[PDB]
Structures are given as C-alpha cells and as structure tokens.
C-alpha cells in the first residue's frame, strides 16, 4: 500500500528519542514537503537506506535534506501560530532569530510566525 504522509511520519517518529524534540518539526517539516512534491516514496527509502547503513535517525533526516532534490535550496515553511508557547517545550532552545536566507539544508527546520508578527527560525 502507497505509504502516506502519515505513516511515513509514524515510521520516523518511531526512530526518534523523546518528543517535540526539533528533529520531530523536521519530520513533519519533511512529510510535508514530500507529500506536495510526490516524494513520499523517494524520502522513505532514502530514511531507510541511511538506518541500513547505520546512521543514526537524526542523521538520516539531515541526509533526506542533503539528498532528496526538492529540499535543495529549499527555504524553511512558515507555520503561523499564536504564542510562543505553541512551540513544544523541547524545541524551545532550538529557537533563534530568523536569519538571512535559512535553508531547510543548512538545519532551518521551519519558522514560527507568531500572532504579534514575531518570528522565530527552528534550528539543528
């Protein structure tokens, strides 16, 4: 059956130590961007290739973005919510001001954009 968007997450999250951690953004970051660019299948195989290899799964999201063609280049996504405190707890130090011109790539997971029009950048 056609992996989803979903079960694709499910898959990743199940490789992933705690939770809200910055690499789950990405996850979700990634299911994204893939499932709009048809790439479902391309970013799963790729994921377990690397964890065949013996990269760990931090590693093996970092490497989708380096490998998978559509996060060249590609700029972070905006996710527009209202406070800070939206953002789960474990990525609350991953947060920095947004630079100039982030790259999913260089370790911009997404940007927040919050209700009073601050901005902050998801970094690993």
């Known amino acids: 059956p056609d992996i989803s968007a979903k079960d694709l997450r499910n898959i990743m999250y199940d490789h992933l130590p705690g939770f809200g951690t910055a690499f789950h953004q990405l996850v979700q970051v990634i299911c994204k961007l893939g499932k709009d660019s048809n790439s479902l299948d391309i970013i799963h195989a790729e994921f377990q290739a690397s964890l065949a290899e013996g990269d ?69």
Do not use: E, M, N
């Open 56 to 124: 760990s799964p931090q590693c093996a999201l970092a490497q989708i973005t380096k490998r998978v063609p559509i996060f060249q280049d590609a700029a972070p996504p905006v996710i527009h919510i209202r406070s800070r405190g939206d953002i789960p707890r474990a990525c609350q130090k991953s947060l920095r001001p947004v630079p100039p011109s982030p790259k999913i790539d260089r370790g911009w997971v997404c940007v927040f954009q919050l209700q009073d029009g601050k901005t902050l950048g998801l970094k690993i």
